[PDB]
């Protein structure tokens, strides 16, 4: 029974899971885009968002500095986290990460995911775009909207 259990069991245990997520998150902070098994990316997305929040908390905050020091194995990223990522998302309140599925890894056919930080300089991903508003169905729904607006 695992009712309400929200954390995946990864690696060799709790500490190993934390370290795996830490390495993935350090790579994410360094490169602004990471490919990894879908489950691991899903687990690490929350920690990525939490790091962005801690960076927003400020460079001078001792708790935020300690959290960044722990979670960024390469210490050159801490200035990056506090001076690039957090200022970039200062306007936003959430959704700093974009996660998408990727074709299964050729090696072991694992479910792969690409996770990036929004607003990075890298080329945009082939995001899924909804159907154009000029399609037949969308135009019919536009007619519905206009008629409802006029009537009421």
């Amino acid at each position: 029974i695992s009712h309400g259990r929200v954390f995946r069991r990864m690696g060799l245990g709790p500490e190993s899971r934390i370290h795996l997520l830490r390495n993935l998150l350090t790579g994410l902070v360094r490169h602004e885009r990471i490919e990894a098994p879908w489950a691991r990316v899903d687990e690490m997305r929350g920690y990525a968002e939490k790091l962005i929040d801690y960076g927003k908390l400020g460079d001078t905050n001792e708790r935020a500095m300690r959290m960044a020091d722990f979670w960024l194995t390469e210490k050159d990223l801490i200035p990056k986290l506090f001076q690039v990522l957090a200022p970039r998302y200062k306007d936003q309140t959430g959704g700093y990460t974009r996660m998408l599925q990727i074709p299964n890894r050729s090696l072991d056919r694992a479910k792969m995911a690409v996770i990036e930080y929004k607003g990075n300089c890298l080329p945009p991903l082939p995001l899924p775009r909804r159907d154009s508003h000029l399609t037949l169905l969308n135009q019919l729904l536009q007619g519905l909207r206009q008629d409802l607006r006029q009537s009421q």
Binding site: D59, T60, M65, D69, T73, K75, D76, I78, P79, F82
Partner: protein, 48 residues
């Protein structure tokens, strides 16, 4: 007021920079050694 941790390689990782940092740790022990006897012992103990 912002105390960024030093930008150095990790001591325990498996990398060229980590190996260099461990070598630096060894050389730091050599430097901290007081007696010339201890310095020579540390410098020549490992036989290769």
């Amino acid at each position: 007021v912002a105390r960024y941790p030093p930008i150095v390689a990790s001591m325990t990782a498996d990398s060229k920079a980590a190996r260099l940092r461990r070598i630096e740790r060894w050389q730091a022990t050599v430097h901290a050694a007081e007696s010339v006897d201890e310095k020579l012992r540390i410098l020549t103990k490992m036989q290769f």
